[PDB]
Design a protein around this ligand. Sequence first.
Ligand code: ZN
Lengths: 426, 1110
Amino acid sequence: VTTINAHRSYLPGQWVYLAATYDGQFMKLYVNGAQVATSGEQCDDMNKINGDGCSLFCRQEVSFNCIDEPSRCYFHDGDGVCEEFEQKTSIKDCGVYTPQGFLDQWASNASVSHQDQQCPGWVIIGQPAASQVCRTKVIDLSEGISQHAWYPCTISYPYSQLAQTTFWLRAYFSQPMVAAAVIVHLVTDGTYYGDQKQETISVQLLDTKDQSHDLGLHVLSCRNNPLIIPVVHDLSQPFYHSQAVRVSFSSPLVAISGVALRSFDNFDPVTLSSCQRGETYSPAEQSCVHFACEKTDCPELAVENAYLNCSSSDRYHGAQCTVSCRTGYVLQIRRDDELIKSQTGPSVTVTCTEGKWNKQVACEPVDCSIPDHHQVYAASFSCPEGTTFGSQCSFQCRHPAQLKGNNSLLTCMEDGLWSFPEALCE
Amino acid sequence: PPSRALYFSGRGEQLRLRADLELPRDAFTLQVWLRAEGGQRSPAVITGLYDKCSYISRDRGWVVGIHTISDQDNKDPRYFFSLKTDRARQVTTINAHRSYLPGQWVYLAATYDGQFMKLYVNGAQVATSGEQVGGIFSPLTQKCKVLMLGGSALNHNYRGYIEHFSLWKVARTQREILSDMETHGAHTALPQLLLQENWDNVKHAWSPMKDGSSPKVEFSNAHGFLLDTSLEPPLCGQTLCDNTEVIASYNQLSSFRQPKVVRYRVVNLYEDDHKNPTVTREQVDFQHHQLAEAFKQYNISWELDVLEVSNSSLRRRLILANCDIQTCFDPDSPHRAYLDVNELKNILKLDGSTHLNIFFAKSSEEELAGVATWPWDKEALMHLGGIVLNPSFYGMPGHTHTMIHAIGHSLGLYHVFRGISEIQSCSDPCMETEPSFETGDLCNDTNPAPKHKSCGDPGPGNDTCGFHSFFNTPYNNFMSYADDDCTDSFTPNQVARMHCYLDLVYQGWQPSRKPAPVALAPQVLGHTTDSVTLEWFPPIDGHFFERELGSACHLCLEGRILVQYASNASSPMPCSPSGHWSPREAEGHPDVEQPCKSSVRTWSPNSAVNPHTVPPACPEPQGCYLELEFLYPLVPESLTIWVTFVSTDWDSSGAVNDIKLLAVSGKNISLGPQNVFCDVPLTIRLWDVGEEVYGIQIYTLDEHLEIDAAMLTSTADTPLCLQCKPLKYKVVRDPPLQMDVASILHLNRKFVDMDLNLGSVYQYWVITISGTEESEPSPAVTYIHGSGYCGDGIIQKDQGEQCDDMNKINGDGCSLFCRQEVSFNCIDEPSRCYFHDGDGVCEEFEQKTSIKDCGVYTPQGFLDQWASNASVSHQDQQCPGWVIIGQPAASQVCRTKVIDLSEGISQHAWYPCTISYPYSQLAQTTFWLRAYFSQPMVAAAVIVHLVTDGTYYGDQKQETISVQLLDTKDQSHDLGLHVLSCRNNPLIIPVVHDLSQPFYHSQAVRVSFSSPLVAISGVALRSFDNFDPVTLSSCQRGETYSPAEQSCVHFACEKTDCPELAVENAYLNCSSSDRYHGAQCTVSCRTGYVLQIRTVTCTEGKWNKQVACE
Ligand SMILES: [Zn+2]
């Protein structure tokens, strides 16, 4: 048999409307014309009577949803159907809220300081009981609290030795994942008559290298269920995984329903390995490959008066080829046909990119510049083929600077300097 | 026969090689031993090749010499090699790595192979360039070349000694340079060595210039130096006891800290009737008893000798400490009613070389009660030095641990917070950022601490420099500023300093006649097949002769050479009314911390307060003059003058107009004008004076010339030093010697042992002997005969060696203790060391430190994107704001606390020159710049390259900058306020981004600062090469990568791996026709069938869940 209760307490001395409808598949309960509960095992209500979801001021009450015209209002928190907007509020229906682009992994195994049959420590494993609203200023924890939660049952309430009892619990997950946030769903807030002050829980994250990273001290309250503790990471430092989460507190009344790690979807720091541009990380192989389905093949590239040495026989994706200039030629490298930083060394690495080359390399000859009085004074340097490498051309000393010698021509040498004048005029 | 040498006086003495040699053209090597005296000309050409006929350009050829770089500021001189072929468009100069040391022999070798120019100083490659290529000159012009030695035609003369001049025709490698270092003329008739001169006869291959101006052929000692006994103190230290090894010897050895009885004398002023004491006998008794009880646990036992001075006039007059000058207060009138401490010391004239005098004077404001004279101070051991204490706080409970603090200050103990709260700026390398022997207090045991009036570990706060959370601070240390009830002990690393300074400086206070031990262990010079040679340093006290009271044995050097400073200064100018820059500051040993920085510890010809308040004092013909007098008149050989600060206009062009030596007979010898620099003291060699000299007169036409000290080196075997008795040494070895030489008096300090056996282990130590009194044994040296050691040419890494170049000399790139030097990299089996930083080649270890070689070091897995657009709050033509665009100029070295920023800073960085310098408006104007980047990306860190720390001379407090990040939506995400320090000039500001909040794309970076002295040469974003917010945007299971549309491609293969699925008694509704990767197909169980799940999702051909309808 299945029973469904109303939404609020009965009001003495009032007229109420009760309607129960059962079609053989679904049964519902209607109070004052409004659907309060249903199971299958702003507003205008044509009245000015409260309790049916719409007040006399035509205002929708809390924990009610009103549709249609005239407005019919029904209860949505706990009805068993997770609507498009119940995720944020209705914990008892949709569980916990997972933001778009995140994944929540709940605790797989748990280790606590005090393990006993009546208060087992493996209750905070798996999905918690989000339908349980926490209890404030609780006196006894023997009713259902130990069923879907954990608490130090073996430890009585301490009055003087409570300052030295360091309660701790460590939760290990099946898989290691980068910790973006820590979810702590509670069932107790730690408030008590004998201990008015609450308890602040400090959470420590344990990595795969057994190192503890402190997340700081954070307060704990019922209004913040589930308690989301962000993981503040220094972006300059490399990311680190996490496999175990440690929760530390001193108040024996602190009971945790569940501990979970909220992480991003993919781009894990496993891909922080040697998987750079030109290759795609494998689905699950602990390694990165470069040819899954990409047809990114670049055509063979040749540079005039230059030396090319490719690291691979074929100029396929990820193939880096070193380019150097012949003696008497300078190296000019332009990334994506644009002016960028040059290469100090005599070799430039060019990588294939989806049928195109990342940078263009040119071995232009070294210009020796137009000669002047620096090389030979009182002379005219008239010569046809410019001032590039190998482009020899002569001079003529004007009157009265008579020139004596067999040769009176220079030659722009391989080091970018004009050759020694074999004859000097006086 | 002993080698000869040439002396060039720098006044016209030059030589030219004859025309019968064919000078090298394609490649060459020059090797020369040279001893350069201080105060050279700029540029003093040691030797160079010059072209006379070619008048269009007269820089053709090469030139080696000494020239000053940064001649505008601090003018420091270095060895330079300059070359310009007949093809290159300019001259190329390569300098040494450090300022040249005067009076020391240097092996200078400059090589050129046709592609590179290399310059080795003492065999270590200190400069390398490759701008010049090709031959130096063609054969046709070969007849128009002249090799000049000692100067050029333009009188770029050289002043000093030259020896063993070798000029080659091929570029000798560093190995051959080192091998040819030791030959000293043992060169065969090679057909490759062009010229080798040992100056047997100058006219064999050289000819003089002018008419008869020729250098002086003299005899030079053939470098008997086999051990570098000159151990330079660290940068932060002041004396030899600050050296790492010398103080480590005291830290480890317990025989170096034997009990010591250190005398001290307490001054008690009395009236003529012996009443009214300054401090009662009870007070002095209590203070002395407490001091003895607090020092006797550190093996020091003070001996008290109270002094009774009965002078009513002195007692009546009020004595004041650190005061600058019954009711008469006229300073001129002798009946004034006040006396400074130094005036009291001058009146008393107490001999402080035998006692630690305690002087009493009121110190009305009491936060530094005890004024102590440091051991390295000039006044440490004379009448005007001692301890100054408040008489009312001398022997009263709660006012007693102030004498121990002053005494510790008098034994060379810095305050424990010296590296934190006693630094001018955060860029000072003397900050104890970590416990070290070379920074701050120079004690490893004392943890860094800030200044604190109370005791107890101070928590985080507004640090003066910017470092918070000091842990394990020595709040209970004596040298801290705690109270008298919570300071209890000296750490057993600060006691070692006290014992070192008692052995070194204060040997006269103690009555025990134990000569100071040899501080450092004997060094194994080399082993033969059956012997060994050991050498050791002189005693730590620095004296070589026995100490005799009233004699000159305390100044005699090793070769009976008497070395003395000035002892009686004078001047015709009336002295300063304030007293600063008095002639008395030009006495004793040099005491200036930094060259050419106007200090009150020198003699300035016009002290005054404001310049040009007095009409020109020094006249045109002769100028002002300082007359120094030496204690012991004698016949001198060399004279050294420490000229510290010279005005910019008088850039060594006659700063010291004359130096007149005054004879005992009264005749005057004029030396003529000299040249002076900052760092190098001006040294002169006096040539056949022939008669005793008692004083000098230094003339000057400069109104800011600051003479710091003087010196008068005597001739060898001076009459005074003959009667001195040299110290002797006794070497003991772990197996006892068969016969023990009772005294090994070796002027080289060398011991040759022949009673050795192969495969055995021996230990050697040295005991000093002064007459019949022995000393504490020197630290033992271990020697395994037939095995390796330090100084054998083989790098045995198991012994801690990192370089071993077969020698025992510092400055060659490998330290004396087989340790690598600073900024020197040593390779090959005999360690050839070269100056790696800046040689144009970036190696594997130069990446993380050499900013100007390898650029900014980007860690693996990251990527630096520099600014592509800039904007500033103040833009001007003189100081443009677009300089920071692009990669920065890493060659620039940061400058701290400089008033003028126009020295090329704007050409490489941006600084706000538009604003005026504010005296009180510095907090009213906020400066900012904003740099936009070409490609916005994630912000992992911000890199800001700085040129200045933004510190002013009048503001010791540093500056802080606030950096803000702007995302693609122009939202300011502040990164925090960060201090400005040039010890980490590439400023890395990490980004602390919470992992829950989605990452943004930073478009621009905004950086704000207050003071206008801050200069930025570039702002960049350090970001991950891979990963981005685009991955988090929309890329689910099966979406690998799409084109540039901030998305991933949904169908990238894996569309046929999953075969057709069949479920019994179930209905399949497939959204997609083909069961591709992650395909969704709803499964509905028929009526009466229970649904079991283990919408199914395909996963690489395998269904993620199993659906059945039972
Ligand atoms: Zn002090």
